[PDB]
């Protein structure tokens, strides 16, 4: 039993982008730190997809 419990997608897992973060960030704060970083790095890429079609 592990499939009906309310936290099944956290109790049971396999591949996820945060497991690169777990590699560089020493600790939880830095591991989410880095994932919030990732959203800032991916948001800048999305801005620059848009300015060459708009300008």
């Amino acid at each position: 039993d592990a499939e009906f419990r309310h936290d099944s997608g956290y109790e049971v897992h396999h591949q996820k982008l945060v497991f690169f973060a777990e590699d560089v960030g020493s600790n939880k704060g830095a591991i989410i730190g880095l994932m919030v970083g990732g959203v800032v790095i991916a948001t800048v890429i999305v801005i620059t997809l848009v300015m060459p079609k708009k300008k």
Side-chain angles (χ1 to χ4, degrees), residues 8-55:
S8 181
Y10 179 99
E11 175 66 30
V12 182
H13 59 80
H14 168 82
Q15 191 62 296
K16 293 196 183 177
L17 174 47
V18 78
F19 304 145
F20 184 58
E22 288 223 314
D23 195 76
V24 182
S26 56
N27 68 353
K28 190 191 288 303
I31 284 174
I32 311 297
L34 285 159
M35 289 299 287
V36 170
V39 159
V40 170
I41 292 171
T43 308
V44 164
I45 286 160
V46 166
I47 279 167
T48 65
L49 288 161
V50 176
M51 184 168 84
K53 292 313 190 165
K54 287 283 186 172
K55 201 195 177 67

